[PDB]
Amino acid sequence: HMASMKKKGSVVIVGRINLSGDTAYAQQTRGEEGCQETSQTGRDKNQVEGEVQIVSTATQTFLATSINGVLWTVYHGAGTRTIASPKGPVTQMYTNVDKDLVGWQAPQGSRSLTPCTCGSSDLYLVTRHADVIPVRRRGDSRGSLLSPRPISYLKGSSGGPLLCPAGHAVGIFRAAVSTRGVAKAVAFIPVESLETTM
């Protein structure tokens, strides 16, 4: 009934993929209880750093990537949810279920990736475990793993970046192409598609 209708919580930044030095590594910045509490209030006072965030809802965890001052992720992870911030929940400024894409204004303190204009097909996929996986671009929205891996290793990395050799953003990881449980290829949202949405 109306009086007891619940509200969905916010997406909460719970960590990041550190790409600042020579070694990529995941960092947790918030534990499960603080995540639950922050999801309900929408108030996250933690300092944000870096380009790739680890984000969570009450039921899912995935990645989000800052490009051109927008923190982007997948609709199948975030739905229409707000994201927690120091002054309360922030409404999405982009939502496109047809592209599996959402975006919020980039958090204060984040750093943004630059959209790639290299036209290169030698890409690198960054996972939630800070693996950097070589991927050969095979089409507008597809690339093949040079070393296929069980889908277990990619689960939870939607919303992460595919990068060019120079570290520019080429796309947002959306889905895995699975044959008998092995990811041989990935699908991504091309950065051009983000730029058109903006």
Ligand SMILES: COc1ccc2nc(C)c(O[C@@H]3C[C@H]4C(=O)N[C@]5(C(=O)NS(=O)(=O)C6(C)CC6)C[C@H]5/C=C\CCCCC[C@H](NC(=O)[C@@H](NC(C)=O)C(C)(C)C)C(=O)N4C3)nc2c1
């Ligand atoms: C609800 O509104 C929308 C709107 C648009 C939309 N667009 C979509 C393309 C879409 O896909 C669904 C989600 C997406 C997905 O799991 N992504 C991540 C990920 O990590 N998620 S996650 O864990 O972070 C999470 C779950 C918390 C958030 C990267 C993959 C990592 C590992 C793969 C695990 C096995 C799933 C294999 C799926 N692959 C296939 O279905 C392909 N078919 C075969 C046979 O292979 C293709 C892609 C069909 C060819 C697949 O990757 N999926 C299914 N859902 C939506 C929904």
Ligand SMILES: [Zn+2]
């Ligand atoms: Zn580039």
